[model samples]
Target: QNLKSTDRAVQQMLDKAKREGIQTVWDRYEAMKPQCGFGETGLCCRHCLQGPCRINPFGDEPKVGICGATAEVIVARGLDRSIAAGAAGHSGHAKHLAHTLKKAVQGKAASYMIKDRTKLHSIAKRLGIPTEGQKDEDIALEVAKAALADFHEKDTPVLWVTTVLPPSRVKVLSAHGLIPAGIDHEIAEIMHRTSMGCDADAQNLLLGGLRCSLADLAGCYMGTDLADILFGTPAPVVTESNLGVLKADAVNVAVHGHNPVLSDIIVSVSKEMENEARAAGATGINVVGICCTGNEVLMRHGIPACTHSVSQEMAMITGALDAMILDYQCIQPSVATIAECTGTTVITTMEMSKITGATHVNFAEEAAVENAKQILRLAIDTFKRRKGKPVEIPNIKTKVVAGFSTEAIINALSKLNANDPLKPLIDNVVNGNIRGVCLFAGCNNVKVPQDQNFTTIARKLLKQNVLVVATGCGAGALMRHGFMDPANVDELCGDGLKAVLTAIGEANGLGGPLPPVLHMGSCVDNSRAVALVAALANRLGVDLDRLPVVASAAEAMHEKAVAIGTWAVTIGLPTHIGVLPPITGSLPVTQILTSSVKDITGGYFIVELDPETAADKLLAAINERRAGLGLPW
Candidate 1:
């Protein structure tokens, strides 16, 4: 009954952990049975600390908080704070990349450079910066300054948001006051409005949350753009996934976290330091990724991903990993505790995100290459210590064809219609060869069997010819299930989808179909999906609300996922969430999110825990949009 994950490799590791009396995430989940309903339902409040108030779910005497806040107020405030936190996290990531870009252009950060001058110039042009006869360094510095300027309040809206989205969508957002004044400004405003004795109107609070979520989108877009400029945009690459990618005879270092600032450098430095690793009784240094960092390198460099989200600790349990490098979000601190028993060195970089039991390597862009070499050497020394130790590897992995960034997809489409890349895709959608498009995004949660919801819904949607694209752990889940294997296209795709994929693959000289599910970088690269749809809407002369596209975060567990989902809805796409959020206590709020909000945004939430039913609802949403476009269902 305690079995938790759909991945066989994860299950095997769980068995090993149990036999060794090692506590894993599942064990902790079992111990946390009967979680508080108040907190789960967003009925608890602790803002000003007058009291940690819990509004009774039932018709009890105390209907409001000590601050006289109602259930709607409490729930709304809680949700608002979540959006703010999520916005802050993603914006902070963008801000880091912005600063790194600034340092690189000024010749201060030798470890970084503008890897993609074309992308740099394209971004400059989009932002309306003058670039004719200008040096790439000067253009990059101006772009970096523009990115940094978006963090604070300004007379103009955030440039990232304004430039990336279609004009129709921007007008709609501006009309509704959903356009954020700035990323940091909206986040700060949410904190202010959600504080005790502040904005108490549930409706108003949720609107504020929507604005903050848009700021999250801006931050995410800027992060992707700057990363593409600094570390080259991702294109199609073949890789493998799962714990089996770990090498027994090599120093296996798994880079964990969401940032590419240090991890990208680690990838390059590992190659230069391979001889040092060989000197330590290892064949070579093997660098694998865990979580979004894995996705970052996987797309660009074809680096294999070991695992993600809930199963990150399981990677250390394999006994083959020499060191686990940590940067920031979605990294489980328990890996440091598990390292005590496994002899795996846990290294934490970043001054802001240090773990108590882990080694600290202060990573700066100026010293990135040296820092990467030092981290690799630590792993090599650790590998020497465990060279002859007994280990159990699952010997399980699957081939993955990933790195379908929006540009990569456009390039593939261009092979079929060289003059207009989007024409082929739009034609397929119009002629009913492709029913619709669905983006799978978000994290893995311990509450659900890992990958179950994602795989189930994805299989259903793919069989129905809904083009499936994934990011973050959602991509990890599907790729681990062989969904990203081009070989599975014939078996997994419907007739229409199979034909289209085959045509694209044949046109692109892949000799076969594209993978059934396209792996679109990491969570921050959800911006790629936005870019794709925005282009489609512009080509078809339609608003985003009328497009036959939708998004789902089946196993979302992070505040950043909350912010991303909110922005997805704000951008006018039917969004599905497999797990019920904490807003159910207030029916009005829930109704607004799930139903009435669509009147304004042309997007609303579909909260169904069952993957099968959720798939049906998502298909229905797609069909609804198709009908609006006067296209066949």
Candidate 2:
């Protein structure tokens, strides 16, 4: 199995940093590594009043804990910890937006201005604020204050939480005592419930964390109408990927992580790094990313990413990396070790992450120029330290056009004026040739092998003549495995796919190329899928609400999957996925969600497992929806 590189692991990283004159980030990590009992199936929880039980998953005879918590509970708790942190991460983003609105309200938020007046006016009206000739700042403050109140509101519209879930789901959540009161209040509730001797019900514990995650997304997206103003509404734009996007002849100070503020600095520092690079007989500095920080920049400006989650370490493995500047989350602590393997440096600008091999450089809106110069110079000097040769650029890359937002999707289909393009293109399977549209999203998991499960099923569905629309990590995996390339349609898929591939030739249809699976961007771009279905319905001269398209088979979904799915359904789309399964044992609760939510939002949810079964279920749903729509069934 080609798993992770854990040989001598942390120590190997430490020794490399020492020999390379790079500072060891900390010994704390080494000490903390032992505390990660959850990673290994040891260190059972025992110190409690109920019982002195110590549960072991792989022990001679597995056991449980003192509080009556089973092995599953202990493992589930680990999952809860990650979910809680994930919830907090997005919630923190929302808090920032609210703060910005507060500044604008007090006439103190002068750094940022509302850019989209149309959205601003629209939000103002939704919140019931009059927006005539009032200075936008004045109107902005009113909206900001109201938005801030959402974090603390008692009842009513759920304030900044309208986006938390579908209005029906929110109503459902409120009915269950799951409705969070406010932002801080909700976070506080999780803490209080998680207190040493508090809510120990494992399922409830996980849900508590999920609620926080839901609130966090709600807080950010629902924040004062200013989010639309500050960060321009995202639209689909072309961008490049792979670390190859970095410049070999330039000082490559790749900034990692997902902070808009740090990213803003990179915008400035990139210019400085370029000037220094040119001064040093080089081209300039190349800035790229890993994970969400990569996503953040790629979605707006054109910042190419090095790779997805697993390959964050690979970029450093390439000796050509000069210095990696970072903020928080997913920044490898073993970076110095990875760098020591080469001749690179690591720097920090966020307090949560700091290192010795890395230097600390504070970034400020006004100090952009000075800080940019400092980092650029450091990156350039580090590049000179290359041992023998420059980092070997890998022959790995794929073309992707990201930046699909909810609004952008809506706007595009409106222009196309045709939703069921599959019908016309494939001749509508119900009538003859064309089959149905299938959403093949999510990262592969165990229930579904992390390997070819997605690819195999996607290929299989194509045999049945289904159009595969993939997003997020699934999209990445498909591209990596060559399934996404049009050439594979005829060679790999069954005869049905060959026929379907021939018909929808517009995509990747130059000469003899076949189009089967269309690769979309990250999970956020799922909003585009929802809009596509709506448009298809609109094109059919129907409610556009009743389309044959279905969303399912998300292989590896994070918290955002649920939020994205719920929102899409609310906007009228049948949603399903493979991750975050009920993970619970409740039946009526499940019934309400699978059955009731459909009534609430005109769509239902399906929890799929295994690729073949998932594909079958998805295809069946699409055919059924097509029949309901009277689309040649």
Candidate 3:
């Protein structure tokens, strides 16, 4: 439950446990509540000095920036700014990856090394970054620089994208000025454009945004090089997810969010804590992650990652976790207070995030071994305080086989429908009538109608036989709701899809092994979806542009989603979004994104808000594209 409402159930359970003389994580949470001032409508803007201008969405809300930017222009620029901001954030991480990859390749780093050489050579060959006989540092630096350049400089050399799409898609992005350069610069430029009086036009704002998104994704894909070289190419590995990952006997220590630079080091430090735990006469210790940190550790180490952002407190409420330690976004100072409520020690590592109940243990990469040990030691010793804590873990978790790369899906194609690969899955992409894919991704918001936004639409697609893939909070939502189990394939999918599941159901990734809907691991994995389309195009022996595919109306957009969409388009896939773009208010800005870009990139922004309507539109776009490709309808 990445949803905010998860707190409600946990609090109730904590109250009951307290009546029974039990302490719990919720007892701590009950005393502290997290607050957000301007996050609800994507209207907060600090780019211009209205100093974090809060756009009121009420009936009489002012829709203009300080310089008279209308709601549309302001909204679009704000949205684009988010794209830039998020890209910048992701790029920062990727930037670190690049630096590390170079070090590892040169055999200069003791803490890390390359994991996927095949991918390195393949990507190097594709990007023409000169992989042959080049030191990992030299080649990685070159690739990093090229990928990082997408957001900057007003030059055509800004490489346009084309994920792993068909040949047709390869041609589309090259003809348009939409190609991106410099991940950091792309975001920086967009921020510059949205300045008080700069690029106030909504359409231009989206133009910059579109480009920013494309380049952002290009940067993410570029990092695959770094990740492969250092962490190894990620393959389907066994791991656990949801609130169940927290152990009752162990000193429960939960690490939350996406900060691998810190988590990677913490993982090592956590093991060292085991010595301290055993020294204390306690033989158990567990380090768990929620949200992105969960993604980071689970993807790399195959450890169980508890569910979404919302499950953090609930997991602690399990009365099992002795200490909850956290770093970034979605984590709160209140979490420290929650630990206080239940008498569990809460530790905050990111010096910047000082929670009420947390003891700050600022961590630096070079000092990871020592600092993490310090944190873990403090955490495990707190298990002595777990004597009468309330612990109630909701019996809700669905097993999923995540981590499907674009190449892997093609490996499944020949086995999907033996009747006719030509026919494809009329409903599903290759199985039943599921003819489209909706990449329902983004952060979970408190404003939407509970889980309705993501699950409602995803369920509709499932019923209609459309392939639905998810990541981040959205993925967590479906996984928790039981849509990921392969045993339900026949029940949830149509006949053709059932056939594929029947034939491959043994390996259909159910029973916590892996599943069809696929969890590609974190937001960066969006590139995997982008790859799937291109790989699919290549598999069909068609031009990339002729494939029948569609992306969805996402509710919450993390930077990774926008970047992936950019690459998907670069690969020639048309995406239909339901959530409002940061620039949804201006007609011209909207028009440029929706139409003009078609000429420039062959595909442009297609926005729709209603989930069902969005799903139908996605289907229509796929069918229309397929018709144009001359496939049998």
Candidate 4:
């Protein structure tokens, strides 16, 4: 049974995969037959070496594990593990970037330099590091040091959270014992508390989940801030997306994964070695992007984004990707198998991540340029070896206006009213020109039909006048399907949103409608949208939970996505996950997440599998929030 993707290129690649005898994620998903409902419901517990036990969802079978743990305990334990893993992923990602930036500030990383001095100074000042008489490098060093402290600090609160979040929000989190002492500490506590018999109360375990989620938020905020200091915060930029970005007559290389460190260097080195690519009888060196790294480069340098994490193999299926350069996160190791079949070179640049058959190019910040040059040279050499090899580049692609950083969004708003930048935007929401904001983030699940859930929910919400912002693979889904295409505003958006976008676009000299979806940044940069919402919340004199904003991780597939959703709820939004999370095993746990959470954290999860109806649920949630604010629905 072949499930056709809404994306034409993806559908074509599924056929190619079949003809070539190669299995895709969908094929393996099918082979699994019926997945275990006990595991799906988080009833399975393997925390202790004594037993790997599970609870029966129905009362017909034994209800508890060997240790006599209840279903609620097992479910909450599983959820805690998921949140901890997700927090580790993001915090670890942030730590590396911050450490690299610190080395760069100390002049140890010769290849890395401060790309955004303004952001460096801004963050430095916010962190209480003096920038007055200090050199930019010195200020950056202090800022980086402060960020590192956020990973380890125990006596004081996380500096990043304190600096990024408003005092009211900070106090609310502190009152709930959810304020993280450090990113690392909160994660360590999760492992400690969720251990066998350490924390048994379902409600207490859930609160631990919220605390770990705040740590996730801390990591994301610091990650985004530090990355902006290194790569320069993204502004408005134009680019193209989809499989068509793969070029047939060039040394085509795709930079996949989450971090921008290696990919950013590769972008610069590609230009330096373009003539070498032409010397290999190719037109030029073409660097397309995939996943969050794709969004990173697309936001900064306007590089064409080829595909997202789920269809990464499809990009290689085009028979044109000479090399796939990977860093870390959301990268499929199976892509190496696909690369081998297609005669493509798969290069792993990170020391921590490597595929079995892939080439390893050690990427150290001290010798980043040389590593980038070597990666590019390998791609060109692979291209030259292809001599007369047949290639089929997909003709499907579309133009997109991406790079909606918080700074860029505010700057665009400034055009509407220079005296009060956010005034126009606030006025629209107050006047009902915009109903609310929806941050759609996370990955494409094989369980769902590729991007069906994301597309259907996005378009439906847009028609309902909801402002949409997206990051991670969710943005990739929208970009591939033309949702980020500004030209679709008139056709897809509700009359009110269309008018608001047109007025703002024309004010900003775009000469057309603004793209309905704001491409904020990578998964880590989800904090950018959070920061914007916090600003709006502060302006409206209300908590973030009081704002008419909702979040969705439709088709979420990664632990980081789960962490992201948890943190979104922690930050006071009615978060929705399109696929059922593992907490359904225990009615108590499920009820806490879906209903009781609002009484405590003022946020909760909504599980709706259908895309159209998911949109309906989100719109109703948004309307409910608006009604609470005494705004017209």
Q: Please estimate how well model 1 matches the true structure, expressed as its whole-model Cα lDDT.
A: 0.92
TM-scores, one per candidate:
0.99, 0.71, 0.81, 0.98
What is the per-residue lDDT of model 3 for residues 1-633, given as tens digits with 9 covering 90 to 100?
A: 223343334344445455755443333444444633345355556665666565565555555556566666666766776677666656665666666655555655546555566666677677666876787556655655555454456454444254344446545554544556555666778878877778866656766777787766765555444565556555555555666666666676776756666676667667766767777656667776677666766666765666565445556556676766676656644556556556667777766557764688886554557777788778767877665554666544556555555544444443455544323433345432445556766565433433456766776666665667776666666666666666666566656445544544444433222254666656666666666665556667776556666665355555555555554554555666555655443455567666676665556667776777766766677777767865543
Number of the candidate with higher lDDT, 2 or 3: 3
- The true-structure Cα RMSD of candidate 4 reads 1.1
Residues 1-633 of candidate 2 have per-residue lDDT tens digits of 122221122233334445555443243333455543333342244335554445443446445455555554544444344445544555555555656656644655444567667777777786678998898877777777766676665655445445423444455555545555676666667656654456666556655654664455455455223445555565655555665666677677676754554564575558645665777766777777665556556656756666544345556655667888777655556775666666677778766567667678875434545766777678788877663574556645545554545455444333323553334442445553456776755444433334345666676667776766766555555544555555666766656556645543433323433434555444434434644554455445554335666766466544444544544444445666665443333333345445665654456666665567767777777777777867653
Worst 10 residues of 1 by lDDT: 1-10
Model 4 agreement with the true structure over 1-633: per-residue lDDT tens digits: 236477888888888878999888778778996999888989898889976898789876678878878899999988888888898988888898888998897888977889998888888877888888888887887887788888776677887777777788788888888888888888899899988878889999999999889889889888889889898999999899998888889999999988887888999889999888888899999999999988899999999999996778888887899999998888888888888898899999888899999999999988889889988989998998888998877789988889999999999999998977888998999899899999999999888888999999999999989999999889999988888899989888999999999999999888998898989989998999998998888778888888899999998989889999998988889999999889888999999998998877678899999988999999999999999999999
lDDT of 3 at 602: 59
- Write model 1 residue lDDT over 1-633, tens digit each, in one string: 235999999999999999999999999999999899999888899998687998888887668899899999999999999989988988999999999999999999999999999999999999999999999999999999999999988777899899998999899989989999999999999999998899999889999998999999999999999999999998999999999999899899999998999789999999998888888988898999999999999999999999999999889888988999889999988988899999899999999999889999988788898888888888988998996798887899999999999999999999999989999998999888899999999999998899999999999999999999999999999999999999999889999999999999999998999999999989999999999999999998988999999999999999999999999999999999988789988899999999988987898999989999999999999999999988889
lDDT of 3: 0.60
lDDT of candidates 1 onward, in order: 0.92, 0.56, 0.60, 0.88
Candidate 3, residue 303: Cα displacement in angstroms equals: 1.9
Q: lDDT: which is higher, 1 or 4?
A: 1
Best by lDDT: 1
Q: How large is the C-alpha RMSD of every model relative to the true structure? A: 0.9, 7.1, 5.2, 1.1
Segments of candidate 2 deviating more than 4 angstroms? 1-64, 69-82, 97-130, 138-148, 153-157, 163-173, 200-210, 219-228, 355-357, 365-370, 418-475, 478-633
> What lDDT score is found at residue 611 in candidate 1?
97
Per-residue lDDT for 32 in model 3?
Answer: 43
